[PDB]
Design a protein around this nucleic acid. Structure first.
Ligand SMILES: [Mg+2]
Ligand SMILES: [Mg+2]
Ligand SMILES: [Mg+2]
Ligand SMILES: [Mg+2]
Ligand SMILES: [Mg+2]
Ligand SMILES: [Mg+2]
Ligand SMILES: [Mg+2]
Ligand SMILES: [Mg+2]
Ligand SMILES: [Mg+2]
Length: 224
RNA sequence: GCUGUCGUCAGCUCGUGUCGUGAGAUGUUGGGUUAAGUCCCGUAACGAGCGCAACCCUUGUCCUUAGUUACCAGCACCUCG
């Protein structure tokens, strides 16, 4: 937005220059002190195009799955999940979540049953050597499946934050043929994603900006 | 049909998903721990079954129920059982 806040937060930065993908060469403005610099001129049109796509997809009661699992990055995804709804994941991505989704329906049902059982006035009124085990199993299931408790169907567009770190999700999203919105850094590969956002990673301010922009865009799209 | 043995050793597999042209692989590998594929943490795997364990019999402590053919603390007698 207006080239200033992005410059301030973290965007014009990359993953050194020893580690990089040649397919990113068209986005690099240059190198500064053995560190690559992202051309912020090219990223703004792509960012705005992603904004319009999310806004127009929101109008129609669809779902955007947010993938942000990373240190200090999945958390902000989780608190961004409140407001504008939409499913999310912030812990490890289970293998075959979008291709073996029929099986994971069963685990979601089990999570729902456990949540009903524990929070119906503490029905776990049995031996104390088993209530703790049941509660910790419930917490373990929650810690992975809580974000996607909703969305009985497949999402119509998957928003990822790091192509390389979460390549499994992008691969199976491509296999299912559903759009992918990704924030590609210098060391990652743009291949496999539809809309590319050549921005920085590993920056709390940057990811905060991206998630808040997504939230406001989807809110505007949802307002109709 | 019934039985021995490896061996009461902790192992043997399947559904869906993914990798390979294929036989196949992953799950079931890795760090710890346990009598145990026992458990935890991690992880293209998510789950489940047969096994392990518990549920059964006996032994050790105590409570309640009842005292005959069993028992004898208190009392009378005893021919002194
Ligand atoms: Mg097998
Ligand atoms: Mg199998
Ligand atoms: Mg298989
Ligand atoms: Mg094949
Ligand atoms: Mg084996
Ligand atoms: Mg095997
Ligand atoms: Mg091991
Ligand atoms: Mg077992
Ligand atoms: Mg047994």
């Amino acid at each position: 937005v207006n080239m200033r806040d992005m410059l301030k937060a973290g965007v014009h930065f990359g993953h050194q220059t020893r580690y990089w993908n040649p397919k990113m060469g068209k986005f690099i403005f240059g190198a500064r002190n053995k560190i690559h610099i992202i051309n912020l001129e090219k990223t703004l049109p792509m960012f705005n195009e992603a904004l319009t796509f999310v806004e127009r997809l929101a109008a129609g009661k669809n779902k955007i799955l947010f993938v942000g699992t990373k240190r200090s990055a999945g958390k902000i995804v989780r608190e961004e999940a409140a407001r504008c709804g939409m499913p999310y994941v912030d812990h490890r991505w289970l293998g075959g979540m979008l291709t073996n989704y029929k099986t994971i329906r069963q685990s979601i049902k089990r999570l729902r049953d456990l949540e009903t059982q524990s929070q119906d006035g503490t029905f776990d009124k049995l031996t104390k050597k088993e209530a703790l085990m049941r509660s910790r199993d419930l917490e373990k299931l929650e810690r992975s499946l809580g974000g996607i408790k909703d969305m009985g169907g497949l999402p119509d567009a998957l928003f990822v934050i790091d192509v390389d770190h979460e390549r499994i999700a992008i691969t199976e999203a491509n296999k299912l043929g559903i759009p992918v919105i990704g924030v590609v850094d210098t060391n990652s590969s743009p291949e496999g994603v539809d809309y590319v956002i050549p921005g920085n990673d590993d920056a709390i301010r940057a990811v905060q900006l991206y998630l808040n922009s997504m939230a406001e865009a989807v809110i505007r799209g949802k307002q109709g």
